[PDB]
A and B are shown apart, each in its own frame.
Chain A
């Protein structure tokens, strides 16, 4: 887009076209037809979550302190 003073180029991050966007769309369908879930990449969360799950296990604290609940 060119204007009186400004000019701006709206780039895009990957090659675009009916040839390639359709392959992307077909994969996006396949993964919903056959329930393919990828793992996220967050190793930090994956570690903290596991340490928390292990620490919180068989804790039985609420039987022990007579907290009504």
Chain B
């Protein structure tokens, strides 16, 4: 909301989100108590909508632009888990870090066979 206020004033803004995975994990925690049947790996049934209705308002527009960087945790290093998997579709540049490279001391541990940009 703060970034959108700065955007609508006509400015251009930087928005950094320190771990967006915790926004859906906090939904998984609450989901079962809200009386909703579990889905694929225990995730809330509304995972893709909870994620889209956020990721959709963080965009540039004709009046002003938001540039963003989002850290996206990957549980158990599993890139096919539903939560990382449903996020790749919402980003233009995806930089995929990996443990099998960091444990060589090679930093930044970016995997060039998995990073990509529009």
Which A residues form the contact surface with B (CB < 8 A)?
Answer: 66-68
**B65-118 interface with A by 8 A CB criterion:** 99-101, 103-104
Give chain B residues whose Cβ lies under 8 Å from the Cβ of A67. 100
Consensus secondary structure, chain B interface: helix
C-alpha spacing A67/B99, complex, angstroms: 10
* A46 CB to nearest chain B CB (Å): 36
Which B residues form the contact surface with A (CB < 8 A)?
Answer: 99-101, 103-104
Give chain A residues whose Cβ lies under 8 Å from the Cβ of B103. 68
* A36 CB to nearest chain B CB (Å): 43
Give chain B residues whose Cβ lies under 8 Å from the Cβ of A68. 100-101, 103-104
B106 (CB) vs chain A CBs: closest residue: A68
Give chain A residues whose Cβ lies under 8 Å from the Cβ of B99. 66
B98 (CB) vs chain A CBs: closest residue: A66
